């Protein structure tokens, strides 16, 4: 359920989205990064094929925000360009993923952070959200 209270939810967390991806869809992840975090990930997957359409992977040790896709059982070429690394240990964060026609747009704490051109093209097959790593998850919502 969108708006379910995830305060005590163990990582990894996995959820079927009620409405899958498509133009106009929005998913928000609210949580806190552990003060002793090394990394975490938020993935959007196609539940049947288990392809990962969008892999979002903040790595705290090197301050890199890694994005990739796992298609046909292989990781693609990573995207790492950032204006700034928008996470910090111990911080509350809000990450918003908006699905546009040609790309995802991802915002952190209310500020646009990056675009990710769709590699997995069949958007409405993207029906699953998985989250894992060194965070306290508070809530996920989608609309």
């Amino acid at each position: 359920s969108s708006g379910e209270n995830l305060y005590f939810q163990h990582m990894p967390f996995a959820a079927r989205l009620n409405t899958p991806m498509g133009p106009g869809r929005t998913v928000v992840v609210k949580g806190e990064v552990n003060a002793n975090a090394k990394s975490f990930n938020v993935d959007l997957l196609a539940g049947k094929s288990k392809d990962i359409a969008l892999h979002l992977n903040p790595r705290l040790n090197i301050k890199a925000f890694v994005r990739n896709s796992f298609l046909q059982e292989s990781w693609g070429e990573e995207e790492r360009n950032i204006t700034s690394f928008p996470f910090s240990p111990g911080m509350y964060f809000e990450m918003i993923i908006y699905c546009d026609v040609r790309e995802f747009k991802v915002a952190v704490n209310g500020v646009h952070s990056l675009e990710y051109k769709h590699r997995f093209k069949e958007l409405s097959s993207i029906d699953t959200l998985e989250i894992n790593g060194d965070i306290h998850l508070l809530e996920v919502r989608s609309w």
Binding site: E94, K105, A107, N109, G110, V111
Partner: peptide, 11 residues
Amino acid sequence: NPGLAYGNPYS
């Protein structure tokens, strides 16, 4: 209300 402390730049 989506309960966004930082707002939504895509709205």
